[PDB]
């Protein structure tokens, strides 16, 4: 039958009908009479629509061939011959522009004169039944319907026929051409009734070929095919198989509970080796401040001018000389770098306006100090294979180092009060609710407690230094840059003040990965002689740069004044995390506020004021040789703030591992102290897990010592 559509109809219509065939997903080889019927429907749609044009009037202009002009409007514009999505697109667009009603089924054409749709259907059966059939299929329709049938008859409601009658003679001539051409073909044994509305399909997902063999190799050891295994599974029913293997399984497979008593836990062993060194990016306990007493705010001002003005406030400069060498570098380079920094600072002082940011010369001194041109050149393996020295990067456990007493004193003095306010908080919306007033009062109390704390000063120092370093690295990637360490505080009298700890020289910072390292050299003034705790300054070079006179009742001290100079490095991640050190304030004060709220849930009243003023209640916050010492809530605030600050400063994988594996043991010990009969399956394994995190970090070793002390004081 398909030979007929090969022969007669034009290409355009046959591929339109083929795409309509693909539309609903049925195959053309099984039933083709539908293809012919609907392609004839589509053909009558065209032949009825084309050759029919309109101009600004009604009364369509009919031309056998559209002449070249702007007057190519089509009388009837076709609906079908398009995908369902576009057919409904045209339906909705016509409804929204023509203000007509939206039909629920697919029309075939639209006309302007009568501003409505045409649903053309030419069926094998006579018209006077198919018409009202499709009419009762369509609900309350104003779209006019018109149908032909092979006998040659026409019909329509309203007795309406919308265009010329010679066109309809055309239609029925086409119709009988179709008819008495099948006459030569002979199809009416099924042509009248060949489609009955079949819609059914079964989804087929068959495993075959290579993928089947893979299925045959992904079974238990004693199975040969997926078919057999699935049959076995379907036939499988529970018949007490877990019990049999449990009985047969060796009894050494057990989870015996070892009781956890007061005498069970042993102190954590600390590693032994050379004392632990300093790792901070700046001096914390041995910092010195040169000040100007200016009225500018933290960010307000220009760095270089402030630094120069602060440094001019000090008199007593001496020619620098080596006091304590780096022990691994070239100290003369550090000396020359310091003198170069001074010289270029003067050079800025001379000229017209202090630059906002200064670049330094790339001398051999800072070329060595900043580690320039030291990365091995990257080459290909095929060119370097016979080199005996060629091997992997050194990948082994870090060097072992024992704890020293300097970190303990540094933390002790990091929780001490100061003679300045190191936090100038921002603005918030004016409090409107009583709860907001309570929150503001609490916040004011904590700010009064923690602002005068060395932890806040360290927070500001780190934030400013890391912000400046990151910005300089991102801006001046190539050229070495000078950045004075600046921090602005407010005195007890209320006068604002600036403080200059020293200088940082940032080097080449072409940082691609988050782990890539930018090297800088840090110089900081101090008065602490490095000849008393040399092991804490393994990586520092310390010079003697001047003498300071601070008013004291013992005449006047006239102390020496040294310069701690070192080469340090950071990374994008480290800079970003060090510039978010202000969340240590959060951590600490959230803990304290949780304490206050928990206690106030007992007594139905806010308990902040008496906690902060009466200072009757105290918490164990340290141990003295006499015994455990307790301090007021403010001291707890400062201690927790210092702990968070040191966590942010000495952060490392060792800290995370020890924290987790020691929190586990802390929970076990707490369960013991709560009389909850705690038990363990392998306590030695937990101990070994904790002890492997303690390698060389001073902070984690101090935490381990604190944990041992807590165990000793606990378990009683």
């Amino acid at each position, epitope marked *: 039958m398909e030979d007929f559509v090969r022969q007669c109809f034009n290409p355009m219509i046959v591929e339109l009908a083929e795409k309509a065939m693909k539309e609903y997903g049925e195959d053309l080889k099984i039933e083709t009479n539908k293809f012919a019927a609907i392609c004839t429907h589509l053909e009558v749609c065209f032949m009825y629509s084309d050759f029919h044009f309109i101009n600004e009037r009604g009364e369509s202009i009919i031309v056998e061939s559209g002449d070249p002009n702007a007057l190519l409007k089509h009388r009837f514009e076709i609906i079908e011959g398009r995908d369902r999505t576009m057919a409904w697109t045209v339906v909705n667009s016509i409804c929204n522009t023509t203000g007509a009603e939206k039909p629920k089924f697919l029309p075939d054409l639209y006309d302007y004169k009568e501003n409505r749709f045409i649903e053309i259907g030419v069926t094998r059966r006579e018209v006077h039944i198919y018409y009202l059939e499709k009419a009762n299929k369509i609900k309350s329709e104003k779209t006019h319907i018109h149908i032909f049938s092979f006998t040659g008859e026409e019909m329509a409601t309203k007795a309406d026929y919308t265009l010329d009658e010679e066109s309809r003679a055309r239609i029925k001539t086409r119709l009988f051409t179709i008819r008495q051409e099948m006459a030569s073909r002979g199809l009416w044994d099924s042509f009248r009734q060949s489609e009955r509305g079949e819609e059914t399909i079964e989804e087929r997902f068959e495993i075959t070929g290579t993928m089947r063999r893979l299925a045959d190799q992904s079974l238990p050891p004693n199975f040969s095919s997926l078919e057999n295994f699935r049959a076995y599974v379907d036939g499988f029913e529970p018949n007490g198989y877990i019990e049999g293997k449990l009985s047969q399984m060796s009894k050494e497979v057990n989870a015996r509970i070892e009781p956890f008593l007061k005498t069970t836990p042993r102190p954590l062993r600390l590693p032994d080796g050379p004392p632990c060194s300093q790792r901070s990016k700046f001096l914390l306990m041995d910092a010195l401040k040169l000040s100007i007493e200016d009225p500018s705010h933290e960010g307000e001002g220009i760095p270089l001018y402030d630094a120069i003005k602060c440094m001019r406030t000090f008199f007593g400069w001496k020619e620098p000389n080596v006091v304590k060498p780096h022990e691994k570098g070239i100290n003369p380079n550090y000396l020359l770098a310091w003198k170069q920094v001074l010289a270029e600072l003067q050079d800025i002082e001379n000229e017209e306006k202090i630059p906002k940011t200064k670049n330094m010369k790339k001398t051999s001194q800072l070329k060595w100090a900043l580690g320039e041109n030291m990365a091995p050149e990257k080459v290909d393996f095929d060119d370097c294979k016979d080199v005996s020295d060629l091997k992997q990067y050194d990948s082994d456990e870090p060097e072992l180092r024992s704890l020293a007493s300097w970190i303990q004193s540094e933390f002790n003095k990091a929780c001490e009060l100061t003679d300045s306010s190191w936090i100038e908080l921002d603005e918030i919306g004016e409090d409107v609710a009583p709860i907001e007033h309570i929150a503001s009062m609490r916040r004011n109390y904590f700010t009064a407690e923690v602002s005068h704390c060395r932890a806040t000063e360290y927070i500001m120092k780190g934030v400013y230094i890391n912000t400046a370093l990151l910005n300089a690295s991102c801006a001046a990637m190539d050229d070495f840059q000078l950045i004075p360490m600046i921090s602005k505080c407010r005195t007890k009298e209320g006068r604002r003040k600036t403080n200059l700890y020293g200088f940082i020289i940032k080097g080449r910072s072409h940082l691609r990965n988050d782990t890539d390292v930018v090297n800088f050299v840090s110089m900081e003034f101090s008065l602490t002689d490095p000849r008393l705790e040399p092991h804490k300054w393994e990586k520092y070079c310390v010079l003697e740069i001047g003498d300071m006179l601070l008013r004291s009742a013992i005449g006047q001290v006239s102390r020496p004044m040294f310069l701690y100079v070192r080469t340090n490095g950071t990374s994008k991640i480290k800079m970003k995390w060090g510039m978010e050190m202000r969340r240590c304030l959060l951590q600490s004060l959230q803990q304290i506020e949780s304490m206050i709220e928990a206690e106030s849930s007992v007594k139905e009243k806010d308990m902040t004021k008496e906690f902060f003023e009466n200072k*009757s209640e*105290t918490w*164990p916050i340290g141990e003295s040789p006499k*015994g*455990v*010492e*307790e301090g007021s809530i403010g001291k707890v605030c400062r201690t927790l703030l210092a702990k968070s600050v040191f966590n942010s400063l000495y952060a490392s994988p060792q800290l995370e591992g020890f924290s987790a594996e020691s929190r586990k043991l802390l929970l076990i010990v707490q369960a013991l102290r709560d009389n909850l009969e705690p038990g363990t399956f392998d306590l030695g394994g937990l101990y070994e897990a904790i002890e492997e995190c303690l390698i060389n970090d001073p902070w984690v070793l101090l935490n381990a010592s604190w944990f041992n002390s807590f165990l000793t*004081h606990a378990l*009683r």
Partner: nanobody
Framework: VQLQESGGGLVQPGGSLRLSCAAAMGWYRQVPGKERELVATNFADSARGRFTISRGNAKNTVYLQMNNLKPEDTAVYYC???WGQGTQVTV
């Protein structure tokens, strides 16, 4: 932790008394007309120089050695770690 205080009683003014508590530790007191008062853990102003706190970690005992007692020391003296029931001191 359970706590039992011993060593209270009736005493002369200017007399001496050794409190002991069988079990950081300390001593607080409660006069009939008031709430808790800190004695020792560090000593309060009202009792400093007169009174001494000590402990024997091998005996599990904290001691309060009271000397040159005043009528104003008359209170129930409570030990703590957890609170004892208190021992009556009357001067």
């Amino acid at each position: 932790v359970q706590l039992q205080e011993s060593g209270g009683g009736l005493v002369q003014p200017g007399g001496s008394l050794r409190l002991s508590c069988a079990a950081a530790m300390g001593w607080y007191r409660q006069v009939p007309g008031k709430e808790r008062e800190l004695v020792a853990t560090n000593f309060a102003d009202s009792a400093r120089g007169r009174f001494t706190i000590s402990r024997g970690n091998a005996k599990n005992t904290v001691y309060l050695q009271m000397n040159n007692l005043k009528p104003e020391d008359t209170a129930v003296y409570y030990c703590w770690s957890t609170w004892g029931q208190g021992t009556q001191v009357t001067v």
